Amino acid sequence: MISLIAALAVDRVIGMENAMPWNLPADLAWFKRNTLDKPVIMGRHTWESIGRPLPGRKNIILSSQPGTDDRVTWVKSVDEAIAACGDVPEIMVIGGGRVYEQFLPKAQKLYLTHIDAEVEGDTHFPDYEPDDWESVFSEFHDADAQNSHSYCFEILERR
Amino acid sequence: MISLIAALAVDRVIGMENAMPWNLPADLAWFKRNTLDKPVIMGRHTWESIGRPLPGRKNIILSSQPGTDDRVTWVKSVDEAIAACGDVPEIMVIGGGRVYEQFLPKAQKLYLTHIDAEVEGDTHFPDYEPDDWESVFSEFHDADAQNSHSYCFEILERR
Ligand SMILES: Nc1nc2c(c(=O)[nH]1)N(C=O)[C@@H](CNc1ccc(C(=O)N[C@@H](CCC(=O)O)C(=O)O)cc1)CN2
Ligand SMILES: [Ca+2]
Ligand SMILES: [Cl-]
Ligand SMILES: [Cl-]
């Protein structure tokens, strides 16, 4: 299956013109836990943001332009991106906006992090229909010495 | 001599307990390059926020409570903290608020990061009267894909 994994601020904001104004090591730890040993598909801006290949995952970049990093796999189409995952049980799509948009229809699960942050966004998570998704897990945490905002982990399965 | 290093939001707001709502890896790199190979003195909330001993530095924690961890040195007073540092050219004071208040009068240098962020908070960096400090280095940086906000590094020398 294909799963989408994202951190949404209020109003589904996922990205801004510059780095998101938060510091959530626990969210990053949740992201690593749920993507480790899985192939991850991303767009070019997200790759550029990450700054390096994510360790222990097969990194696939979906883009129309030629790639510039020999350490990852560059594909030009959603179909190519999938085939590039080969035979695995679950493919993780990590954004951003357009990539989430194109893969949502084919997705069966969403791993979401809701952060209580009000910001002006540039890109947002596509609108999903809560009537079509079943929340199977949820876990609330307040901001703390190491995390700047409060956040809640959620896993949804397509009804 | 003793120096204070701090990151300030608008109106000199500084953290109190929860992590600050920003993500500035260029600022942490600045912090590291300026404190490496030097003793650092911090209060108990700062120690929790950092989460582990800063490597390459002697970690001194100033608190009235029993010190947990054996890899750091736990002191009960300013004078004990200074003595624990021994004979070095520069002692770095890393906060928080009360700690900065206590060492300010003894400080001859300030490494400051002015962040263009409006954060609501209780604590402020202590009021320093720039007349008694000459600004000797200032360098502004815009927010980018890695850094959430604009920030300006500055070093002031006590005159
Ligand atoms: N310039 C500056 N001073 C400040 C802060 C800050 O964020 N910036 N602080 C808080 O507001 C306090 C220190 N908080 C800190 C939080 C994390 C790290 C840290 O992990 N530093 C690593 C960098 C490795 C990496 O960058 O992850 C290091 O120094 O080894 C240091 C200080 C006080 N002084
Ligand atoms: Ca449920
Ligand atoms: Cl992208
Ligand atoms: Cl403190």
Side-chain angles (χ1 to χ4, degrees), chain A residues 1-128 130 132-159, chain B residues 1-67 69-75 77-105 107-128 130 132-158:
Chain A
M1 110 219 91
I2 282 175
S3 300
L4 280 52
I5 177 169
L8 278 55
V10 163
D11 297 339
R12 298 180 294 125
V13 178
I14 54 179
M16 276 166 100
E17 267 193 56
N18 294 301
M20 301 301 276
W22 58 65
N23 183 14
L24 311 169
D27 170 57
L28 290 184
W30 158 263
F31 176 94
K32 192 193 187 183
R33 158 190 293 276
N34 284 307
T35 60
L36 210 42
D37 316 307
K38 306 177 191 169
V40 297
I41 295 173
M42 75 192 89
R44 187 181 307 241
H45 298 283
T46 289
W47 157 245
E48 294 178 354
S49 303
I50 280 143
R52 60 156 161 171
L54 285 162
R57 280 152 282 196
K58 165 167 210 200
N59 295 240
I60 292 159
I61 325 272
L62 164 70
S63 180
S64 262
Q65 301 92 58
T68 54
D69 196 297
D70 285 324
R71 302 164 291 179
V72 298
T73 301
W74 297 85
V75 300
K76 333 283 271 190
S77 90
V78 162
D79 282 351
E80 319 202 339
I82 296 171
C85 295
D87 249 79
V88 296
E90 174 183 23
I91 296 152
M92 308 294 296
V93 168
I94 74 168
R98 294 279 297 138
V99 171
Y100 283 136
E101 194 208 352
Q102 295 172 97
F103 283 80
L104 187 53
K106 307 191 112 101
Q108 277 314 326
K109 188 162 199 213
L110 311 181
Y111 293 79
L112 302 183
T113 301
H114 301 285
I115 301 169
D116 183 18
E118 270 246 31
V119 294
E120 252 244 310
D122 173 25
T123 52
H124 300 246
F125 192 77
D127 212 332
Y128 57 108
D132 328 327
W133 293 86
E134 177 184 359
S135 179
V136 298
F137 173 82
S138 89
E139 190 182 280
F140 186 77
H141 289 284
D142 286 320
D144 62 27
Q146 299 185 114
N147 296 268
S148 71
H149 290 72
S150 84
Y151 52 98
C152 176
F153 294 139
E154 189 173 40
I155 302 165
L156 303 104
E157 283 182 353
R158 217 196 257 273
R159 289 169 190 288
Chain B
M1 54 180 148
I2 289 180
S3 303
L4 280 41
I5 181 159
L8 323 186
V10 333
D11 288 352
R12 322 197 304 324
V13 171
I14 65 191
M16 185 178 49
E17 158 164 322
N18 294 166
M20 301 295 267
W22 67 53
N23 178 39
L24 306 172
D27 178 61
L28 298 186
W30 157 265
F31 175 90
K32 182 169 165 180
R33 126 177 65 111
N34 282 307
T35 56
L36 207 56
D37 294 324
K38 285 174 207 182
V40 286
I41 293 172
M42 76 191 89
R44 170 111 57 179
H45 295 102
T46 294
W47 164 240
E48 314 274 6
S49 294
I50 296 178
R52 32 81 186 248
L54 299 157
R57 282 147 284 186
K58 177 180 224 224
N59 300 236
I60 295 179
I61 312 349
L62 216 191
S63 177
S64 46
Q65 316 294 119
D69 195 306
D70 68 69
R71 335 172 256 176
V72 301
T73 288
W74 300 91
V75 301
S77 95
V78 167
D79 285 302
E80 277 162 74
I82 299 176
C85 281
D87 243 295
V88 292
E90 190 170 16
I91 293 176
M92 294 302 293
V93 180
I94 71 170
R98 302 267 318 107
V99 176
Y100 288 135
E101 291 166 4
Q102 285 151 94
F103 279 93
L104 188 65
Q108 43 200 248
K109 196 144 151 214
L110 303 170
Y111 298 82
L112 297 179
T113 302
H114 308 281
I115 304 161
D116 295 318
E118 320 202 324
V119 167
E120 21 139 329
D122 286 293
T123 308
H124 293 265
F125 181 74
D127 187 6
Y128 58 98
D132 330 4
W133 290 92
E134 90 209 85
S135 150
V136 311
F137 169 88
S138 133
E139 164 196 284
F140 179 92
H141 294 271
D142 272 298
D144 61 25
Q146 270 53 59
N147 296 271
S148 72
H149 294 81
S150 274
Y151 47 99
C152 185
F153 300 119
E154 174 171 45
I155 302 190
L156 296 102
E157 301 193 340
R158 187 157 232 155

